[PDB]
Design a protein around this ligand. Structure first.
Ligand SMILES: NC(=O)C1=CN([C@@H]2O[C@H](COP(=O)(O)OP(=O)(O)OC[C@H]3O[C@@H](n4cnc5c(N)ncnc54)[C@H](OP(=O)(O)O)[C@@H]3O)[C@@H](O)[C@H]2O)C=CC1
Ligand SMILES: NC(=O)C1=CN([C@@H]2O[C@H](COP(=O)(O)OP(=O)(O)OC[C@H]3O[C@@H](n4cnc5c(N)ncnc54)[C@H](OP(=O)(O)O)[C@@H]3O)[C@@H](O)[C@H]2O)C=CC1
Ligand SMILES: CC(=O)Nc1ccc(-c2nc(N)nc(N)c2CCC2CC2)cc1
Ligand SMILES: CC(=O)Nc1ccc(-c2nc(N)nc(N)c2CCC2CC2)cc1
Ligand SMILES: [Co+2]
Lengths: 159, 159
């Protein structure tokens, strides 16, 4: 099974320069709640974005998506295929932009935080998936982060 | 995964006299979208309340949690355990008021429609269970039904 979770600016950006152009403790607990205990899959670059000092994320089955037998994610599992990770019952695709579009076929749910930040689409930006006609959800209430940036939450299901 | 799904009055009422005292098509397409494909678990009263012309719910593993050995539900399994209904990887307890409180201990997700209705809790109503402190979630924003009614959804999570 697959879920996709990501935090995006309005413009669609999920990463820039290997980090995230914001920080939102409202989004952080949201992300911990949904993924705690479940399987988390991330691309290799996302894994690098995790300081070795919060790696792995605690309480979850950390899976790093790479292509070779020659990469070690230390404290995690390194699988050449997406499908090698989906051995558990809930699997959460936690980025970045590749795995998303790679996992979007297997996916029924997208949990999306939309940060109200005016972030023009720069080249090389990692981007949130392209959710076609099929997906359904509705716009949330613009909620106030202590950060001072509006955010809102989205949930999608498709069948 | 064990989810509990219900639509309730702002007083807590989910059913009364073997029927539902309201009608919300937006709820029905939502209830349908959430359960579609999955094991649905219902009480035997819930199962009866469905006219034949809507039995069983299409595209889902209907499981009826009942008590007669000679009880067969045309288009469903009759289990005694809740867990014998909890076989499935995604499992939705769809009612009713007793089956709910039975399952809540094994629930990781509660998914709630709240109809904005002046409905007293009268003896003989079916009600929604009480979500303990393990539960965390967000209060939806009041949307407007083509029935003409304000409703909002609740998603509650505990792990
Ligand atoms: N805002 C948010 O909500 C999120 C933000 N991010 C941000 O996303 C950014 C980076 O994400 P991105 O840049 O898209 O790179 P990824 O995180 O997607 O990692 C990509 C890597 O995964 C491996 N890979 C990709 N496709 C496959 C495949 N089909 N089979 C096997 N292995 C595969 C390769 O690793 P190798 O090269 O070793 O083969 C590739 O380099 C960071 O800034 C991160 O913080 C992260 C998560 C969500
Ligand atoms: N608004 C909504 O979202 C929904 C509303 N409703 C409403 O709820 C009302 C009825 O619900 P309710 O009255 O609570 O009855 P329930 O629907 O909760 O069904 C009660 C069932 O409990 C079963 N049961 C309980 N424990 C066990 C056990 N350990 N082993 C086996 N069977 C068990 C009984 O089986 P047996 O009977 O075989 O002993 C009985 O069928 C109606 O008005 C209905 O329309 C129902 C579903 C959804
Ligand atoms: C900035 C910080 O310190 N922590 C932090 C960073 C990102 C997220 C997050 N949030 C949402 N909504 N979806 C997601 N897929 C992610 C995950 C991204 C990562 C793989 C590591 C939450 C907290
Ligand atoms: C509106 C209409 O005509 N039918 C209708 C009645 C109820 C529900 C519903 N809704 C939520 N949120 N949870 C639920 N478990 C259920 C139903 C469970 C049962 C069938 C008996 C949806 C549509
Ligand atoms: Co589904």
């Amino acid at each position: 099974m697959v879920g996709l979770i990501w935090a995006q600016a309005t413009s669609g950006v999920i990463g820039r320069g290997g980090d995230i152009p914001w920080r939102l403790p409202e989004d952080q607990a949201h992300f911990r709640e949904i993924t705690m205990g479940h399987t988390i899959v991330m691309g290799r670059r996302t894994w690098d974005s995790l300081p070795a000092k919060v790696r792995p994320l605690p309480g979850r089955r950390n899976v790093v998506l790479s292509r070779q037998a020659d990469f070690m994610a230390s404290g995690a599992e390194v699988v050449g295929s997406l499908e090698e990770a989906l051995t558990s019952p809930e699997t959460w695709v936690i980025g970045g932009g590749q795995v998303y579009a790679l996992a979007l076929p297997y996916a029924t749910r997208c949990e999306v935080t939309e940060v109200d930040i005016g972030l023009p689409r720069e080249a090389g930006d990692a981007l949130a998936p392209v959710l076609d006609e099929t997906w359904r959800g509705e716009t949330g209430e613009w909620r106030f982060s202590r950060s001072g940036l509006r955010y809102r939450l989205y949930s999608y299901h498709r069948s």
